[PDB]
Amino acid sequence: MNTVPFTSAPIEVTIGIDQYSFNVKENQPFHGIKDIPIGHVHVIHFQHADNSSMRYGYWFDCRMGNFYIQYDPKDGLYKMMEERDGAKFENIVHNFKERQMMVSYPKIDEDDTWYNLTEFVQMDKIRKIVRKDENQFSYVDSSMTTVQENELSDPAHSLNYTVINFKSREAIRPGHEMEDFLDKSYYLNTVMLQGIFKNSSNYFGELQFAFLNAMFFGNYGSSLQWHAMIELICSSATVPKHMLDKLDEILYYQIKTLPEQYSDILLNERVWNICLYSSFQKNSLHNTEKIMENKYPELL
Amino acid sequence: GAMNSSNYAELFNNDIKLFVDDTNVYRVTVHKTFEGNVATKAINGCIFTLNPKTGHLFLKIIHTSVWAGQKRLSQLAKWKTAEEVSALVRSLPKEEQPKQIIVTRKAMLDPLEVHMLDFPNIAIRPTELRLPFSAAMSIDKLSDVVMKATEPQMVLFNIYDDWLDRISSYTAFSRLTLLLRALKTNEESAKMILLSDPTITIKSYHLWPSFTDEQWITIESQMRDLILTEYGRKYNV
Ligand SMILES: CC(=O)Nc1ccc([N+](=O)[O-])cc1
């Protein structure tokens, strides 16, 4: 079990760790988060009390180094940093634990939620989406544009998600216009899965990363990417059976975790109605359809 | 964006543009079968592709063989239209290719956009005008060449005859849409108006009768009467 210590908490802030969150008061004696499960990526995220604008945060994997948080009063935010001196770090954490200045990652043992939301997420593949050269961890905030969006205006500090565009030459084979537009199987299976991602695990990883950035930061381009990757599968008549079963599980847990009051902004009515009721896969997402109909029947 | 009453003179500027109307591409007769079920029989159709500035009409005849063995024909018809419009554009010299294509029905936007991805600089636009181009098959010479076709064929016409020698393209388009609106609202009456006087003939190389300027004013007034009437006979006013 790993630890992310905090130098201090000089400004009042709501701190998130994965799907959990807690309030820290200005200059409260808070020195970090302990008992963080090894084996999963994690996100530690922030919303200042005085400016609910800009939620921001850091994707990290404690197996890749020793990380801590320190407020920067010039740039006005909590920054993740790496400590290379392993003995200095163990000694800092041990003192903060002895003084009980840390919150415990509060995982219920029955609870597979975070695993289920991050099953295919990879932190080495977040070096494709957010290549901030030196960083082992990855900063994301509410306002970050996608690299694609720079073309419909900063791409090294943006989300380099895979460009999906259903009315593009990449998506449409000359001479197969109607076929490829109405059945996107060649775009999904040949262009994206065999040519770009390499396998479905990679496809699910970006799809899961896109959802989590939409949910935790309200990142609009991430929400667009999540829905596009869903719609590309649902609009394909030919999808490996294991992918459809896995997609139903992925989406089920995303819909389960979504805050009830954010469904208006985070869910695209058109995509979900098409996917669940009109698309080739309308009968293939039983778990997702059932939770959507019981939790958000208004949207449908 | 969409074409409407406000930007109407844009049709007659010097940027090449084409209207595309697909309402006569997929045509059927509905009939009873011997078992008393209902079935359709396709008949020949056409794509109506019109330069409103010059009057040049590219009439692509859609022979019923193109539907053989195909499903969901009303959907296929939109994609076939877009395929043929795209092939027409590719067949034209660069300097004759349109800078905009205006579709008369919004359901043609995605099919045409996808078929024209090779032409990112050609704008594909809808319109809020309710244009009467469906009535093109009430023009006898157009109906005749479509019904006689035994294979796919493209036939070129000038839908304004020689009017542009005497009037502007704005006025010519206004006359065309009046004639076609009349034919659409009451075909028999409209056709009676156009041919009542047998001393006014249709030249072999024309679609419409050889009216003088003064006879066109009378004709045009008769078509307006027809349209307002039917609008009464319809709503009782
Ligand atoms: C092309 C490609 O594999 N992208 C990608 C794969 C995985 C992730 N991820 O977060 O796990 C993100 C992006």
Swiss-Prot record, chain A:
Result, substituting residue 236 to D/E: Disrupts interaction with PRP8
Positions of region (Leucine-zipper): 244-265
Protein name as it appears in the record: A1 cistron-splicing factor AAR2
Top-rank taxon, per record: Eukaryota
Miscellaneous comment as given in the Swiss-Prot or TrEMBL entry: Present with 7330 molecules/cell in log phase SD medium.
Family statement: Belongs to the AAR2 family.
Keywords: Cytoplasm, mRNA processing, mRNA splicing, Nucleus, Phosphoprotein
Record note on quaternary structure: Heterodimer. Interacts with PRP8 (via RNase H homology domain and MPN domain), competing with BRR2 for the same binding site. Component of a U5 snRNP complex that contains at least the U5 snRNA, PRP8, SNU114, AAR2, SMB1, SMD1, SMD2, SMD3, SME1, SMX2 and SMX3, but is not a component of the U4/U6-U5 tri-snRNP complex.
UniProtKB/Swiss-Prot annotation, chain B:
Effect annotated for changing residue 22 to A: Reduced growth at 30 degrees Celsius. Strongly reduced growth at 16 degrees Celsius. Strongly reduced growth at 35 degrees Celsius
Region listing for RNase H homology domain, in residue ranges: 7-237
Domain of life: Eukaryota
Subcellular location: Nucleus
Effect of residue 23 to A: Reduced growth at 30 degrees Celsius. Strongly reduced growth at 16 degrees Celsius
Subunit structure: Component of the U4/U6-U5 tri-snRNP complex composed of the U4, U6 and U5 snRNAs and at least PRP3, PRP4, PRP6, PRP8, PRP18, PRP31, PRP38, SNU13, SNU23, SNU66, SNU114, SPP381, SMB1, SMD1, SMD2, SMD3, SMX2, SMX3, LSM2, LSM3, LSM4, LSM5, LSM6, LSM7, LSM8, BRR2 and DIB1.
Comment, domains: The MPN (JAB/Mov34) domain has structural similarity with deubiquitinating enzymes, but lacks the residues that would bind the catalytic metal ion.
Note: Present with 468 molecules/cell in log phase SD medium.
Role summary: Functions as a scaffold that mediates the ordered assembly of spliceosomal proteins and snRNAs. Required for association of BRR2 with the spliceosomal U5 snRNP, and the subsequent assembly of the U4/U6-U5 tri-snRNP complex. Functions as a scaffold that positions spliceosomal U2, U5 and U6 snRNAs at splice sites on pre-mRNA substrates, so that splicing can occur. Interacts with both the 5' and the 3' splice site, as well as the branch region. Has a role in branch site-3' splice site selection. Associates with the branch site-3' splice 3'-exon region. Also has a role in cell cycle.
Name the record gives this protein: Pre-mRNA-splicing factor 8
Source organism: Saccharomyces cerevisiae (strain ATCC 204508 / S288c) (Baker's yeast)
